[PDB]
Amino acid sequence: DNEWGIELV
Amino acid sequence: GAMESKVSFKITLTSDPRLPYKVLSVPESTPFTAVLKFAAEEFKVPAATSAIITNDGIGINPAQTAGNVFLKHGSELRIIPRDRVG
Amino acid sequence: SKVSFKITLTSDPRLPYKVLSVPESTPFTAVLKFAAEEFKVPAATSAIITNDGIGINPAQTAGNVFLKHGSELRIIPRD
């Protein structure tokens, strides 16, 4: 879901 | 911006000789369990059995904000998937 | 100068939260909107309330909201 807003870079 | 500052981690799958990695940028207030799950998925490994450790062999307590982990251990982390039984 | 809020989406049983800092003069409408966007729910139908079940009028400064209710707020998505 990614409800904690983690971003891949 | 109104959105919380982010901290970034370089997470390496040391088990792979190639030492591949994923950089994750994460809101400081994020429970580290979310980071571990996110990392496991990026590495296609079971979130429930994998662990994140520091480059100096400390296990990271997942009940802890990303901010804390960043502040105490810096950005170089290792992801440790379990072996199989049988 | 900025004040900060912990907004919890209590309807998500994981209770995910986000922290927002806005200039204490900011109209609370901006934060509601910001919170809506980050939580990926409609700004138009979303409300922000407090832990004790008081509804926050957004035509108010974030500063004044902070002064009266503190940092712990819930975002309430419509049906």
Side-chain angles (χ1 to χ4, degrees), chain B residues 6 8-9 18 20 24 28 31 43 52 61 64 67-68 84:
Chain B
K6 291 166 184 308
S8 54
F9 299 99
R18 255 163 294 103
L24 280 49
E28 290 193 14
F43 280 108
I52 310 286
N61 194 338
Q64 181 167 49
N68 272 322
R84 270 265 57 195

Side-chain angles (χ1 to χ4, degrees), chain C residues 1-68:
Chain C
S1 195
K2 293 177 165 174
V3 292
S4 58
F5 299 100
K6 199 220 214 172
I7 304 181
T8 293
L9 183 72
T10 39
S11 67
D12 186 323
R14 292 166 304 183
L15 303 190
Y17 57 77
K18 292 183 191 305
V19 184
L20 294 78
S21 295
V22 298
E24 65 154 343
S25 44
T26 310
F28 206 72
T29 303
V31 182
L32 205 193
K33 188 168 83 70
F34 273 116
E37 301 172 2
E38 307 185 2
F39 272 111
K40 293 180 153 194
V41 293
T45 62
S46 296
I48 301 279
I49 70 166
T50 72
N51 270 338
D52 43 348
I54 291 300
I56 288 168
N57 192 353
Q60 219 187 153
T61 67
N64 266 313
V65 166
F66 182 86
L67 233 54
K68 307 188 329 193

Side-chain angles (χ1 to χ4, degrees), chain B residues 1-36 38-86:
Chain B
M3 168 173 303
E4 193 180 33
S5 307
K6 291 166 184 308
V7 284
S8 54
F9 299 99
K10 175 173 165 184
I11 308 168
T12 304
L13 183 79
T14 52
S15 42
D16 186 322
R18 255 163 294 103
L19 305 185
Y21 65 81
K22 308 276 177 274
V23 188
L24 280 49
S25 187
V26 9
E28 290 193 14
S29 284
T30 286
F32 206 75
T33 70
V35 184
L36 169 272
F38 192 100
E41 295 166 348
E42 283 296 322
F43 280 108
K44 334 250 270 287
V45 304
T49 50
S50 307
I52 310 286
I53 73 179
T54 71
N55 273 339
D56 61 282
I58 306 295
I60 290 148
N61 194 338
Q64 181 167 49
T65 73
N68 272 322
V69 174
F70 184 73
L71 237 41
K72 200 183 184 214
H73 302 290
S75 65
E76 264 89 304
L77 305 177
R78 299 170 181 215
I79 186 180
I80 308 302
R82 284 220 309 240
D83 64 351
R84 270 265 57 195
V85 174

